[PDB]
Design an enzyme around this catalytic site. Structure first.
Site, short mmCIF file in Angstrom:
data_model
loop_
_atom_site.label_atom_id
_atom_site.label_comp_id
_atom_site.label_asym_id
_atom_site.label_seq_id
_atom_site.Cartn_x
_atom_site.Cartn_y
_atom_site.Cartn_z
N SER A 1 -18.68 26.88 14.07
CA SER A 1 -17.93 26.99 14.99
C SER A 1 -17.72 25.32 15.65
CB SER A 1 -17.27 27.64 16.60
OG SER A 1 -16.24 27.21 17.32
N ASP B 1 0.57 -1.00 -0.45
CA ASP B 1 0.21 -0.05 0.02
C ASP B 1 1.19 1.26 -0.41
OD1 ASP B 1 0.95 -0.36 3.19
OD2 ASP B 1 -0.77 1.02 3.36
#
Lengths: 150, 432
Positions: free
Chosen positions: A124, A73
């Protein structure tokens, strides 16, 4: 019910239908780390998924004979490039380093391209959040993406 | 250099420059020897053909490209000696090039109006000192446990935050209208999707009840004669279901990613993460109200360049989320963003003028404080520090944001910045 004389036909008085449409089978349980999603095998390659369907010949061809490669990978990491591939958080944004990308060195025309309120999304939402211990919470791919690039 | 300036499109001043035939004739001939050296024709020059001849005949092709070059070099030449402060795309309206005569052309370019910073006392900002305790972190964790609560049936006394199974008769004036019922209808409380007050009857009865409540329709109901009209609903409350505050098992705690996945560990870890997000949130709070008040104190009509730059950015930013389809951005009208785009650039000019006027530079102790407080989330941010020292394009941008933060604080110095010790969920506006 669908006719002119109100009868909740112009506005359903009950706003929670449900109607037992997909009674909690899959829409209830989280697949955790995408076992049967994103590609098809969430962990190993297996390759025997399509076997019973029709064929076991990957799919067609694609880079590295599709994503059925047993081991390897880390296409970088060996010399110095990448160093630690993704580094848990897949780079993401903060797990990377960056706070504001843009194109304007010593500009001040920034401000509103992260405001949230009529500019992005939310304000937020700082009610805890927490537990951001890296976590691959953004895109994590390679080989071929967008107009054919690695 | 013959020029004729006329203020045409407001800020767009038309400096009609006239480049003399000798200046063009020299520059084309100077370009041809550049091409001659490049292609080595200068070495293959036998010198029997005069250079004035090749300048007009062979350089007839190159005349065009030299004109456009000269227009750019006469623009920058002009604005300096004329003491002009230019802006926009210089609309070079090219007059007819008569081969042997002067090339007259009208350069219609905008100007930057310097920012008339008025009283920054007019700005009003709030600085809420958000305190957190064990009751606040545990209360928030409780809310999160209610977000991730496993709902299950119970029987008996309904409570005002449950969801239930009723079977109501929808009636107006005590007249049950057709379609107007719902059997085995699962109703949830708090959510304002339903009729206001319709949940009320459920919230103060038993799981073996049948009763008719007097609740008024919404004014958002799609019938004028029925919107905000007192109706009857024979609520057959057959079941009640309560949320289960999930297991505080250490493995469930860390399932979210709580690395210190203990109980006091959950409280402590989520606490220090709360303050780190609240750091950036409190910064954005004081800064956003500063900027709000700054432009509320100050007005400036910006040249089309900067506004339309922001328009294009906002068009791509919009179309990105609005489908993400092929280049739909470029067709979105100026007026779609014009007000708020101008507003963005106005702030950029206000704070830009604060930088210039107050000779305000990016302070290295502010860059220190910013980097360390941001990287305080990490135990060892070698990634972050090395990325600065190996990417100066972000490291100077670290100073650019610090520059803008100090700019804001220099504006706060004059602004009506009140301060108060407030509750935890003040900046934590969203819980559901």
């Amino acid at each position: 019910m669908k006719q002119s004389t109100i009868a909740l036909a112009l506005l359903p008085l009950l706003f929670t239908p449900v109607t037992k449409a997909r009674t909690p089978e899959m829409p209830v349980l989280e697949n955790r780390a995408a076992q049967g999603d994103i590609t098809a095998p969430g962990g190993a390659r297996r390759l025997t998924g399509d076997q019973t369907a029709a064929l076991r010949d990957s799919l067609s061809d694609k880079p590295a004979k599709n994503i059925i490669l047993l081991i390897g990978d880390g296409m970088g990491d060996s010399e110095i490039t990448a160093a630690r591939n993704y580094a848990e958080g897949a780079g993401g944004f903060f797990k990377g380093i960056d706070a504001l990308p843009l194109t304007g060195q010593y500009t001040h025309y920034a401000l509103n391209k992260k405001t949230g309120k009529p500019d992005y999304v939310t304000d937020s939402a700082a009610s805890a959040t927490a537990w951001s211990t890296g976590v691959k919470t953004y895109n994590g791919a390679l080989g071929v993406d967008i107009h054919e690039k690695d | 250099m013959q020029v004729s300036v006329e203020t045409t499109q407001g800020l767009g001043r038309r400096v009609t420059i006239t480049i003399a035939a000798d200046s063009i004739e020299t520059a084309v001939k100077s370009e041809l020897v550049n091409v001659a050296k490049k292609v080595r024709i200068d070495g293959f020059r036998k010198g029997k053909v005069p250079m004035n001849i090749v300048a007009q005949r062979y350089g007839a092709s190159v005349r065009q490209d030299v004109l456009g070059d000269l227009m750019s070099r006469n623009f920058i030449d002009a604005i300096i000696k004329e003491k002009i402060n230019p802006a926009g795309a210089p609309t070079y309206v090219p007059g007819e090039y008569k081969l042997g005569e002067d090339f007259t052309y009208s350069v219609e370019f905008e100007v930057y109006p310097e920012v008339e910073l008025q009283g920054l006392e007019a700005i009003e900002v709030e600085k809420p000192i958000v305190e957190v305790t064990d009751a606040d972190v545990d209360g928030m964790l409780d809310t999160l446990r209610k977000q991730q609560a496993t709902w299950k049936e119970k029987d008996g006394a309904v409570e005002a935050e449950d969801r239930v199974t009723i079977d109501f008769t929808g009636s107006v004036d005590g007249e049950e209208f057709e379609g107007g019922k719902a059997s085995d209808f699962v109703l949830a409380m708090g959510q304002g999707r339903m009729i206001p007050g319709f949940e009320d009857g459920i919230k103060g009865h038993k799981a073996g009840e049948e009763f008719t409540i007097d609740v008024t329709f919404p004014e958002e109901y799609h019938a004028e004669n029925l919107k905000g009209k007192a109706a009857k609903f024979a609520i057959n409350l057959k079941k009640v279901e309560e949320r289960e505050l999930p297991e505080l098992t250490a493995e469930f705690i860390k399932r979210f990613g709580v690395e210190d996945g203990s109980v006091e560990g959950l409280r402590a870890e989520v606490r220090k993460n709360m303050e780190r997000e609240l750091k950036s949130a409190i910064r954005n709070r004081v800064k956003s109200q500063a900027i709000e008040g700054l432009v509320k104190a100050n007005d400036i009509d910006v040249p089309a360049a900067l506004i339309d730059s922001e328009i294009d950015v906002l068009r791509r930013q919009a179309a990105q989320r609005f489908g993400g389809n092929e280049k739909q951005a470029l067709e979105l009208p100026r007026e779609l963003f014009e007000e708020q785009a101008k507003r963005r650039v106005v702030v950029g000019l206000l704070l830009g003028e604060v930088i210039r006027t107050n000779e305000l530079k990016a302070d290295e102790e502010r860059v220190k404080g910013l980097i360390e407080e941001m990287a305080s989330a990490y135990e060892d941010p070698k990634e972050v520090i090395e990325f600065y020292s190996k990417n100066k394009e972000l490291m100077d941008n670290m100073r650019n944001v610090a520059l803008e933060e100090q700019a804001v604080e220099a504006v706060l110095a004059k602004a009506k910045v009140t301060e108060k010790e407030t509750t935890f969920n003040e900046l934590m506006n969203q819980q559901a």
